[PDB]
Structure formats: C-alpha cells, structure tokens
Amino acid sequence: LNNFQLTPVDVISALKAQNAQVAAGQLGGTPPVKGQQLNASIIAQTRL
Amino acid sequence: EDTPQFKIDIDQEKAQALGVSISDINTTLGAAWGGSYVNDFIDRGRVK
Amino acid sequence: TNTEEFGNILLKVNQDGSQVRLRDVAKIELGGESYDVVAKFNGQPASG
Lengths: 48, 48, 48
Fold this sequence. Notes:
This is part of a larger assembly, with three copies of chain A.
Chain A: H1 8-18, E1 23-27, E2 40-43
C-alpha cells in the first residue's frame, strides 16, 4: 500500500464504488408513450 | 394569536453571482441565530 | 408550493448573463407519485 501511495481509505472507496447493486429504472416505464409495446427492467452494476 | 416575525429571504440571483452557496447561507444563519448541536463529549463519565 | 415556483428554480447563470431555470430544462406539473395502478369503476375513471 505504501509502495503505490495508497491506504485502506482508498481500498474502502474502491470496494464501495465497484461492488454495489444499482437500481436503474425500466424501459417503457409508466407513464408510457402512446402505443408503447416494450417493457423491460434495466440491469445496472451488480455485486461481485 | 398571530404575531410579527422577521422574514429574511435570500436572493438566488445575487447569491449565485457572488458565488455563495445557499447551503452555506442557511447553515450560517441557523447555527448563528438558533444554535446547532454538533456532537457529544464525555465529561465525568457522561455523554454530554 | 406551486408549479410556477418550482419552474423558477435557478440552475446556473450563463456567461452572457442569461439565466437557466428549471422550466428551461424540464416540464413541471402535478402528477401521481406512481403511474402504475389505474382503477376503473364500470368503465369510468375511479379510485378507491
């Protein structure tokens, strides 16, 4: 950690940023456009 | 019954022109004139 | 309180002095928290 000028704070920040479950809404979610035919969830970042 | 009150309203245009954050203004006003509870301390074995 | 007050929120000030407000980059209106459930009574609009 000292060799690369890092600390446990950097490790915690990286773990929290890169290991997370993110909610991202949907495709064609309500209120939808007139004549919308597609509805699907969006899958964003997921836990390692 | 209703009583007089001092109405101080911030100006968004002027605050932004001078580069003053509304959060800073509100925190300054509140902490100065109403008081803020920041944290605790331990005196004689009691959290105060 | 109103939608007119919300549409007057100042986001940033352009270099040429023109101001950008919420109504300039959005469309503010009173609407349901969720547009998911939609009830009808004998074919009429309803809620319950």
